Design a protein around this ligand. Sequence first.
Ligand SMILES: CC1=N[C@@H]2[C@@H](O)[C@H](O)[C@@H](CO)O[C@@H]2S1
Length: 504
Amino acid sequence: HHHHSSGLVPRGSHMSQPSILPKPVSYTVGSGQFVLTKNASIFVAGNNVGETDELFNIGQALAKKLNASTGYTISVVKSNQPTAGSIYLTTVGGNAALGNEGYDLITTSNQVTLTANKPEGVFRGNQTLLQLLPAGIEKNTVVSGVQWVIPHSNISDKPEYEYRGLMLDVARHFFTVDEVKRQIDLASQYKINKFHMHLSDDQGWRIEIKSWPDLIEIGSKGQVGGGPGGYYTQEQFKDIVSYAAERYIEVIPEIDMPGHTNAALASYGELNPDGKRKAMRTDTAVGYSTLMPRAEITYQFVEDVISELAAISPSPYIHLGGDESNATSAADYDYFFGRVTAIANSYGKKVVGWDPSDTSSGATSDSVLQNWTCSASTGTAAKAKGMKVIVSPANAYLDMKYYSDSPIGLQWRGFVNTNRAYNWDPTDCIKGANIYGVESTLWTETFVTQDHLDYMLYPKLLSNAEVGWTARGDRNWDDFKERLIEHTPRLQNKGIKFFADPIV
Ligand SMILES: CC1=N[C@@H]2[C@@H](O)[C@H](O)[C@@H](CO)O[C@@H]2S1
């Protein structure tokens, strides 16, 4: 048999007919079709009144999306007797084998029926439902001239990995609450279920800490290149968390330590050995900053920050960073990370950290490793300790240029086009581990606008999202590439300023 790899498409990028992404476990089509009309209602039914109430909220979110493009006013009804032309969302009789996030989605001529184990699974299944309707449905304004049809079809689905995440760096360049909400919303449509916020680094501190007000008053006032920066009040952070929660997305906040701490060091002189504030940094260098690993003031500061953040962040996890502590000795790093893990645990939070934080003697088997280095020795400690691992290889570093000539992005991991972002497996990063899942990381050294985010995340994130959801045995670039071409109008309709990658 003959085989080949993909080259660029001759003559440039290519960028009734559903386009489901990520690819579901099974999808069959039969004869006939369902028509969504102005008379349609969404019926919801759970196993008890409380579950029906949660399903009702999910139905209302769906109705809002459908109403925006159809111009209809679909309403939501608490009843297990759907009428002809209805969409029906239920958890009664879910197939337990599909887990919390799995669902069956069956479309007949008279009815759309989504059956799941949990409300979460009906939410994920609704992302598929939106992809079965014609392109146009994802418009934010009324579309005329399109019959709103769904083919007679049968889908069953569930994720391969539990953790399917996106990290946004808001320290290097700041993005508004609206901009952040929009990226969460877009990611949710591709079944991303985790959002990691890199809230602090050398060039800025982005979270209000009432006990240390100069973190904002001084530490938030810049960014890479010297723009004005910005920050989130605690109320704005809670608002983001609440918005994510409506999409069944866990928000994991990161306060990076003991390295990548210049902004804190520029806010409070007492955090530095000579008692003087550091100058703010607007360059892109890394590795040079450190908290004082043997000063009690350091641990007081960390405990105050953790206390306030834990109070407003319901996730059982806090990310304490731990990357590129090149101004911290190995002995001091071991000690520091063990101490801050104890502080986090005392506030009821488990710790996530970049490699090499798993090597800390103070880590527990409840700690999580985010393995970005993905070398043979990375996560040896994590594996021995029974720690879950989130993988972020080169292929998930979405801030990398697509090509040598990309107008934005970095290239210290090489270039990452849409193909590279697809053609990998979590076991390529680390073998013999408990892989919790995957996280796409969007660092923002070179991204200043919403259009820059869109351009780098789309279509790259779609590739990573399929790697997280779809089983390896069912992943194939030639398949995905053709499905992506078909999906392109939907990206356009959503207002995403995506890159038309010539490999697609
Ligand atoms: C972990 C990591 N720490 C660094 C980040 O601070 C940079 O922003 C990123 C840019 O790609 O490179 C490595 S990844």
